[PDB]
């Protein structure tokens, strides 16, 4: 069983409502994912930093079948789950290699509504 891929990039879609932590390989194929509204609590109880750690710590139950040694991290977008997702992945067992911020910086053109966030 399993493909047994060495290292891989971890795409963390950090938003205000929730945080989707997905651990993918070298190419871009997802093995298994984990989210904030999946781990027990839902509604508005998520999106917080220590709710992101229970989400990123739920991935090591489904991706343990592959057996990854090293891991590169990748954060996208603002919110309370940027530095928190990196701390849970570190206390799990996998090593650090490349932490990058691929947040889409606009060239001042497209603008969404004002509205207050959580």
């Amino acid at each position: 069983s399993a493909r047994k891929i060495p290292k891989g990039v971890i795409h963390v879609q950090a938003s205000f409502n929730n945080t989707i932590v997905t651990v993918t390989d070298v190419r871009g194929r997802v093995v298994s994912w984990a989210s904030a509204g999946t781990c027990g609590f839902r509604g508005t109880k998520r999106g917080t930093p220590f709710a992101a750690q229970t989400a990123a710590g739920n991935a090591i139950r489904t991706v343990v079948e592959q057996g990854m040694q090293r891991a590169e991290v990748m954060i996208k977008g603002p919110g309370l789950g940027r530095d928190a997702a990196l701390r849970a992945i570190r206390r799990s067992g996998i090593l650090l290699s490349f932490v990058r911020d691929v947040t889409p910086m606009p060239h001042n053109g497209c603008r969404p509504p004002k509205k207050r966030r959580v």
């Binding site: 917080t48 930093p49 220590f50 709710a51 309370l80």
Partner: protein, 154 residues
């Protein structure tokens, strides 16, 4: 805090065993100003416990209340508009005070016989894991650590 500093309010120590922290248990079980009969609730629960246990009555009292003593509790503080359920870490001065309040209530919320057996039962039930006294330690831990993100670490 700066204007008017009071340390603590203390009365006379424990009868013959000599202890000031155990003297708060006779002061909390105090019903309407009767310290003469409140002595008969604590000291008779010391006389009846020596058959159920082996060691000294001061030791079994301290080894059991550690399972009733909390480490972190929730306080209501508002900021910005919404009421935050921020958990502040409880110390040794307030933690020993919160342990004897839930052992007081659990003794009264069990209408069996007299208060000499009700306090003696909830004293050994904290060591094995039974009663309403030890359940409140794990119930306050359900409100805490679930709202861990509202408070930052030291």
């Amino acid at each position: 805090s700066r204007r008017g500093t009071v340390e603590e309010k203390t009365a006379k120590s424990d009868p013959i065993y000599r202890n000031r922290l155990v003297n708060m248990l006779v002061n909390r079980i105090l019903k309407h100003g009767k310290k003469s009969l409140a002595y008969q609730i604590l000291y008779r629960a010391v006389k009846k416990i020596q058959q159920k246990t082996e060691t000294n009555p001061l030791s079994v009292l301290r080894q059991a209340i550690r399972g009733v003593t909390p480490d972190i509790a929730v306080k209501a503080r508002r900021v910005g508009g919404s009421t935050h359920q921020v958990p502040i870490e409880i110390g040794s001065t307030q933690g020993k005070a919160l342990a004897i309040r839930w052992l007081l209530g659990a003794a009264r919320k069990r209408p069996g016989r007299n208060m000499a057996f009700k306090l003696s039962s909830e004293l050994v039930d904290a060591a094995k894991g039974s009663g309403d006294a030890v359940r409140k330690k794990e119930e306050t831990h359900r409100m805490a650590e679930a709202n861990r993100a509202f408070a930052h670490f030291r």
